[model samples]
Target: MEVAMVSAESSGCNSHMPYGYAAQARARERERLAHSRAAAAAAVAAATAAVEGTGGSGGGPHHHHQTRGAYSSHD
Candidate 1:
């Protein structure tokens, strides 16, 4: 029995990894990166909207006709 078990161990028959184990880890990492970008975009949009809502020129550069002599991006 000991010899039989030793032979099986060196037969290379079990030389295989679990199903989709490698891809599972890779897919999770990709999703993590994707979500990070998504959150950044949302935060930028929220900040821009908040600034524009406060009467800033974030909507467009129409300050040429609306703003006074001095020009400011947030105007």
Candidate 2:
């Protein structure tokens, strides 16, 4: 009876496959990394846009007009 029980447990436990669990952990990690990366990207984009928006309030139109005037004068 003990030998049969031991054999049954051994076979039952040994048949277990970690494929699903392994992929679940991998998918979880991938999602976390993607989430962090996306957040970082969003923060960077917002900061850049804010800086550009402030800087462009003056420099952007002036630079654009300067280049356009130079080209038109040459033509």
Candidate 3:
């Protein structure tokens, strides 16, 4: 718990900390990428559903609206 406190406080200083940054960032980034892509696929699926829910009966501008909206929500 104490170690986590110090780590969180210094997370912003990761560029200079020089310990576990590369390993952790690389590992997490790799896994996170995989997870993000998976979520992105699901985002598209849900976005389609959301568009339909919001009256996107046709392939109109609302398609882009809901798609971008989904991405924005994730961000």
Candidate 4:
């Protein structure tokens, strides 16, 4: 993640010299990263619940874990 951020920052700095859309591009990148993190967190939560054997029984084997609302709208 640090590498990614460093690359993004470097790209922004390089692009800002000749491009007027750097700020907009960086904002979009930030949004994309936020969504990515939210999705990852949701996946981790589901995996943890499954590994701990505390997931909902009403769900089938494929969907045993709780459906966290995190990043659902992003998809």
Candidate 5:
């Protein structure tokens, strides 16, 4: 919390991003990627779903989306 407060208060950053510059940026990117890949994730899920269940990449993209979403839930 102290580190985040410091960055939020006196970092003098050009943007209002909080936490150390890179940390917040990475968090934001993670959050963004999670949401931004929605369409791609859907496409991947559909494509893989066409394959044999459990043999190919079936559910691979779905799991990928879930992983990203799990992280973004905190961000």
Candidate 6:
């Protein structure tokens, strides 16, 4: 899993009247979209690198072969 963090306070805060509230809302929306795009780009780059055999332990096989097993209710 990957996580991306963006702070709305860094963009700005609305402490005044109606106009400031609207403007601050728009700014926060823009920042959210920008952060989403950056996160998506990073995910794509990481996936591509893994597929190209660049992401692996000791630079070995990039793909991991595993088997699936059924789970039981009792341990």
Could you say which candidate leads in lDDT? 6
> For residues 1-75, could you state the per-residue lDDT of candidate 2 as single tens digits?
355433323444756554656668778867877776664666566566444433334535433333333434444
List of clashing residue pairs for candidate 6: none
Model 4 C-alpha lDDT per residue in residues 42-69, reported as the tens digit of each score:
6566566454445455845665678676
The total number of steric clashes, by the backbone 3 Å criterion, in model 1 comes to: 0
> What local lDDT does model 1 show for residue 25?
81
lDDT of 4 at 58: 81
State, as a TM-score between 0 and 1, how close model 6 is to the true structure: 0.19
Clashes of 2: 0
Backbone clashes, candidate 4: 0
Better of 4 and 6 by TM-score: 6
Full-model lDDT for every candidate: 0.60, 0.56, 0.56, 0.61, 0.58, 0.62
Model 5 root mean square deviation, Cα atoms: 30.7
| Residue runs of model 6 more than 4 Å from their true location after superposition | 1-22, 36-75
Score candidate 2 by lDDT: 0.56
**TM values, all candidates:** 0.23, 0.21, 0.22, 0.18, 0.19, 0.19
How would you order the candidates by lDDT, starting with the best? 6, 4, 1, 5, 3, 2
User: How well does model 4 score by local distance difference test?
Assistant: 0.61
Off by over 4 Å in 5: 1-25, 42-75
Q: List the residue pairs that clash in candidate 5.
A: none
- The sequence of per-residue lDDT tens digits that candidate 3 reaches over residues 4-61 is 4334344556466556565677777678668756646764665665434343457555
Model 1 regions lying over 4 Å from their true place? 1-10, 36-75
List candidate 3 segments past 4 Å from native: 1-17, 25-40, 49-75
User: What is the C-alpha RMSD, rounded to one decimal, of candidate 1?
Assistant: 18.1
Query: What is the C-alpha local distance difference test score of candidate 6?
Result: 0.62
Please name the candidate that would achieve the greatest TM-score relative to the true structure. Answer: 1
